[PDB]
Amino acid sequence: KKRYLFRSFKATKFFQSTKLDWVEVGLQVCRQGYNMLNLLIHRKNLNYLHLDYNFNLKPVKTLTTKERKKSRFGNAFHLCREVLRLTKLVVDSHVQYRLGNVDAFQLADGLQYIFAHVGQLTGMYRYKYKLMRQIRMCKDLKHLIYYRFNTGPVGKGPGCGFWAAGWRVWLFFMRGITPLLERWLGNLLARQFEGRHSKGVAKTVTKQRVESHFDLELRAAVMHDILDMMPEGIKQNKARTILQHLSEAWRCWKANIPWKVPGLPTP
Amino acid sequence: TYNRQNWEDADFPILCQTCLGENPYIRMTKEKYGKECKICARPFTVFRWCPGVRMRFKKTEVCQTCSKLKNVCQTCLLDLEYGLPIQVRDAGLSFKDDMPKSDVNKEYYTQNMEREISNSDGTRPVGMLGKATSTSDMLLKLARTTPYYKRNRPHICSFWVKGECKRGEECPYRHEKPTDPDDPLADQNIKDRYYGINDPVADKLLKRASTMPRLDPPEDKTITTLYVGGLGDTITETDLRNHFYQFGEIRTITVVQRQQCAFIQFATRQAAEVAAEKSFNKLIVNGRRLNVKWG
Amino acid sequence: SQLSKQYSSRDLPSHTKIKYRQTTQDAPEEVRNRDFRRELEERERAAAREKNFKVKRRWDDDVVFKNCAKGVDDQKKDKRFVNDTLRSEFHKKFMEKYIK
RNA sequence: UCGGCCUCCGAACGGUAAGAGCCUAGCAUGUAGAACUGGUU
RNA sequence: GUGCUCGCUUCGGCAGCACAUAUACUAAAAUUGGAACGAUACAGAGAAGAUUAGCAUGGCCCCUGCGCAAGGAUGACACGCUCGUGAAGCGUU
Ligand SMILES: O=P(O)(O)O[C@H]1[C@H](OP(=O)(O)O)[C@H](OP(=O)(O)O)[C@H](OP(=O)(O)O)[C@@H](OP(=O)(O)O)[C@H]1OP(=O)(O)O
Ligand SMILES: [Mg+2]
Numbered sequence: 013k014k015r016y017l018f019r020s021f022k023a024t025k026f027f028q029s030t031k032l033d034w035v036e037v038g039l040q041v042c043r044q045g046y047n048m049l050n051l052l053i054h055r056k057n058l059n060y061l062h063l064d065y066n067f068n069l070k071p072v073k074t075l076t077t078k079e080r081k082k083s084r085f086g087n088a089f090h091l092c093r094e095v096l097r098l099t100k101l102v103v104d105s106h107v108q109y110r111l112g113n114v115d116a117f118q119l120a121d122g123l124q125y126i127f128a129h130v131g132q133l134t135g136m137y138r139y140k141y142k143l144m145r146q147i148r149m150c151k152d153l154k155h156l157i158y159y160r161f162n163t164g165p166v167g168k169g170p171g172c173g174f175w176a177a178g179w180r181v182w183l184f185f186m187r188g189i190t191p192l193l194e195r196w197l198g199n200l201l202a203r204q205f206e207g208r209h210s211k212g213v214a215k216t217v218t219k220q221r222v223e224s225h226f227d228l229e230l231r232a233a234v235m236h237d238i239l240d241m242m243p244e245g246i247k248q249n250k251a252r253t254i255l256q257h258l259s260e261a262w263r264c265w266k267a268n269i270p271w272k273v274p275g276l277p278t279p
Numbered sequence: 280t281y282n283r284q285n286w287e288d289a290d291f292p293i294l295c296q297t298c299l300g301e302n303p304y305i306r307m308t309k310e311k312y313g314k315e316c317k318i319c320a321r322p323f324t325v326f327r328w329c330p331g332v333r334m335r336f337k338k339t340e341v342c343q344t345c346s347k348l349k350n351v352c353q354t355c356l357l358d359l360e361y362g363l364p365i366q367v368r369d370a371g372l373s374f375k376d377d378m379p380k381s382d383v384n385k386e387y388y389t390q391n392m393e394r395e396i397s398n399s400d401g402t403r404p405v406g407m408l409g410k411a412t413s414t415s416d417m418l419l420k421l422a423r424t425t426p427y428y429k430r431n432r433p434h435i436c437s438f439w440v441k442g443e444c445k446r447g448e449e450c451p452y453r454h455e456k457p458t459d460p461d462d463p464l465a466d467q468n469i470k471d472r473y474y475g476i477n478d479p480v481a482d483k484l485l486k487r488a489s490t491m492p493r494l495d496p497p498e499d500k501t502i503t504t505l506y507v508g509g510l511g512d513t514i515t516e517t518d519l520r521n522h523f524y525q526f527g528e529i530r531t532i533t534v535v536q537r538q539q540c541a542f543i544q545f546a547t548r549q550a551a552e553v554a555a556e557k558s559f560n561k562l563i564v565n566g567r568r569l570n571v572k573w574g
Numbered sequence: 575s576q577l578s579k580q581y582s583s584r585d586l587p588s589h590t591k592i593k594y595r596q597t598t599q600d601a602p603e604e605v606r607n608r609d610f611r612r613e614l615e616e617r618e619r620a621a622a623r624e625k626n627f628k629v630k631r632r633w634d635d636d637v638v639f640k641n642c643a644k645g646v647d648d649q650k651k652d653k654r655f656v657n658d659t660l661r662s663e664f665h666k667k668f669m670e671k672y673i674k
Numbered sequence: 675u676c677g678g679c680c681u682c683c684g685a686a687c688g689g690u691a692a693g694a695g696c697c698u699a700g701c702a703u704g705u706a707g708a709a710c711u712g713g714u715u
Numbered sequence: 716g717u718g719c720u721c722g723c724u725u726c727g728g729c730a731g732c733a734c735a736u737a738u739a740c741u742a743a744a745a746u747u748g749g750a751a752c753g754a755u756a757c758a759g760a761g762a763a764g765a766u767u768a769g770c771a772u773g774g775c776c777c778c779u780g781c782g783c784a785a786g787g788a789u790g791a792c793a794c795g796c797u798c799g800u801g802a803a804g805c806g807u808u
């Protein structure tokens with residue numbers, strides 16, 4: 013089903029509509045995202061951190077061990093901060109064209125450089141290593157545009173302007189990367205506002221937890237297979253002593269030592 | 280380790296007539312989990328509406344489980360049967376219920392009674408309903424029956440308290456000057472009013488209820504013959520005999536029109552004292568307001 | 575838990591359909607009318623059917639021991655399933671293969 | 675008088691313990707609630 | 716309010732009709748209680764000699780993370796339970 017979320021917002025009284033210039037919308041979105049990141053800083057009281065304006069994060073002062081440990085972030089926050097830095101760069105290029113500081117050919121060539129130099133200007137690879145496929149395709153499109161372009165009297169000068177192919181590539185990446193980002197930010201918001209479930213959903217038994225969980229389940233099987241031939245009576249069940257007997261038996265088998273306790277019941 | 284109290288997600292707020300208002304034609308708003316409970320902190324169902332015209336846009340404070348526990352209003356936090364504080368009702372009837380003060384034990388016991396009400400019928404002010412039927416002993420001398428709208432009256436314009444409400448009458452908060460902050464009646468801790476511990480309104484109404492001799496009587500020097508003034512010839516001996524027939528046998532039922540005295544005397548001294556405590560400016564015999572004194 | 579707002583990527587909607595057994599997949603409509611007994615004896619019968627001057631000596635005469643490869647036959651001795659890994663034949667092969 | 679093939683490219687965790695407490699921030703409320711006094715041997 | 720009137724009757728208003736229909740936590744508040752943990756002092760790194768890799772396990776112990784991942788000192792913390800004295804019950808004298 014289509015399920016237009018913009019119509020879902022437009023049905024509500026919290027969202028209205030207007031007509032706006034796209035440069036003003038980009039300035040609004042950049043100011044909004046800067047305010048969101050400052051608000052996320054102040055939510056966790058990380059006032060010894062600081063965002064620049066160009067979405068550059070830096071500590072105000074040196075950290076302690078507690079401030080070192082608690083300020084470790086994830087991929088989603090840092091990657092969307094870098095994405096907001098990239099959109100800030102695009103909005104800045106649009107603004108300095110709109111003030112007439114650069115030419116429109118310069119704005120096209122600057123968009124060409126921005127789309128061809130994403131990873132050389134932003135830290136995509138530090139938080140998601142998949143994106144250099146797209147950066148390789150941007151480089152290949154740059155070389156194809158350059159070697160279709162440098163054909164006659166033009167050379168390797170700095171004024172080549174084309175941005176539609178990299179625009180296509182990064183926006184098809186953006187519709188790819190949107191719902192994983194939304195789910196990661198939703199889990200971030202739920203851990204921020206509902207708190208962290210310290211117990212929560214039970215952990216998987218991974219590779220580092222194989223032998224410990226195997227011996228734990230073996231010990232539980234020992235308890236379930238030792239509680240059941242006991243008749244009525246016997247206050248000294250001595251299951252700790254049976255565990256010591258079993259551990260000594262396994263250690264003596266590991267040591268190839270003949271293990272025998274002559275005082276031990278037969279089954 | 281996976282324990283929590285469940286959320287009060289239900290309709291039908293149990294409210295006073297006073298906070299309910301005077302309009303039969305009521306428009307209503309309901310938030311599902313908008314706020315939390317003011318006592319047990321469960322996320323409860325918020326009910327916000329406008330009972331009249333000069334209004335606070337009143338809304339519910341505590342959860343429906345706490346209101347089911349204490350039989351008080353969800354807004355006014357006073358007992359629904361009489362309009363009285365729960366400190367007054369617990370002093371009148373039974374004060375052995377109480378509540379734990381620590382948060383973890385309070386939430387655990389709240390989850391226990393929430394499970395109890397969820398297994399129960401649903402419309403019951405828990406265990407002391409069987410012992411709360413013995414009412415109108417003294418608390419109905421001062422229990423409200425009128426819908427009190429001066430507590431539903433909206434909050435004070437603090438801007439015109441500072442003298443700077445530029446809106447004037449456009450401001451929906453009250454443009455009257457506030458009460459005394461040094462007055463202990465103005466303090467009103469909400470948890471104290473819930474717990475029934477040292478509520479100043481409850482202490483003021485208890486101090487007021489200590490003033491009237493509605494059941495003192497006994498002005499006769501070891502004599503069962505109590506003379507009820509204010510009776511006259513309207514109260515005869517037959518009304519006193521019918522009143523004392525429930526208490527046993529009437530030793531002396533008479534009417535004296537010279538002193539306007541209904542002379543009531545049961546055969547038992549305890550029954551005569553009970554009849555005098557009933558008729559000491561608190562009973563009407565044959566349409567005549569009786570006030571017991573010496574006879 | 576009726577209140578959680580954290581969503582794992584293994585908690586996504588996926589594999590939401592349920593395939594069912596067709597009549598080529600031993601549907602319960604034919605499980606009831608089919609009797610498995612004479613199927614089992616016909617398949618066991620099929621399995622039982624398809625179960626089946628100067629002269630020198632000999633040049634190799636200058637040795638001390640003759641015909642030493644006489645009773646050497648593996649056959650089903652390796653096929654004897656010893657359920658003891660100290661005496662497992664695969665374990666012995668493992669030790670001689672992985673220990674020089 | 676004769677053909678072309680071109681892997682890759684970086685980040686965190688893992689080290690500069692943990693605990694403890696006192697005054698201090700940031701941030702949560704914009705609330706519910708004030709009832710007062712009279713009859714006889 | 717605007718639109719309209721077999722208007723009242725002046726050409727203004729009024730009268731009638733028509734449609735117009737119940738904004739809002741309402742504060743620009745007042746006050747209310749918890750507070751990062753920086754500072755100082757406090758403080759001392761598991762495995763019986765030292766040097767110590769670690770995975771657990773526990774629950775009203777939590778942090779960082781998007782976690783059904785991994786770290787947080789292995790994140791922290793998480794032993795001591797075989798004879799007389801009598802008692803009552805029933806059986807024997
Ligand atoms: O066309 P040019 O002006 O001579 O520069 C391009 C290109 O630079 P620009 O994108 O700024 O134009 C590359 O530089 P970067 O993109 O890495 O910043 C670089 O080489 P690569 O394309 O391999 O990255 C370069 O040098 P070279 O000629 O040695 O390759 C050359 O590339 P072109 O071959 O496409 O001209
Ligand atoms: Mg040691």
Ligand SMILES: [Mg+2]
Pocket residue numbers: 220
């Ligand atoms: Mg490890």
Ligand SMILES: [Mg+2]
Pocket residue numbers: 786787
């Ligand atoms: Mg760790």
Ligand SMILES: [Mg+2]
Pocket residue numbers: 769789
């Ligand atoms: Mg370790």
Ligand SMILES: [Mg+2]
Pocket residue numbers: 789
């Ligand atoms: Mg370690």
Ligand SMILES: [Mg+2]
Pocket residue numbers: 790791
């Ligand atoms: Mg730990």
Ligand SMILES: [Zn+2]
Pocket residue numbers: 294295296297298299352353354355356357
């Ligand atoms: Zn009420």
Ligand SMILES: [Zn+2]
Pocket residue numbers: 316317318319320321341342343344345
């Ligand atoms: Zn509650």
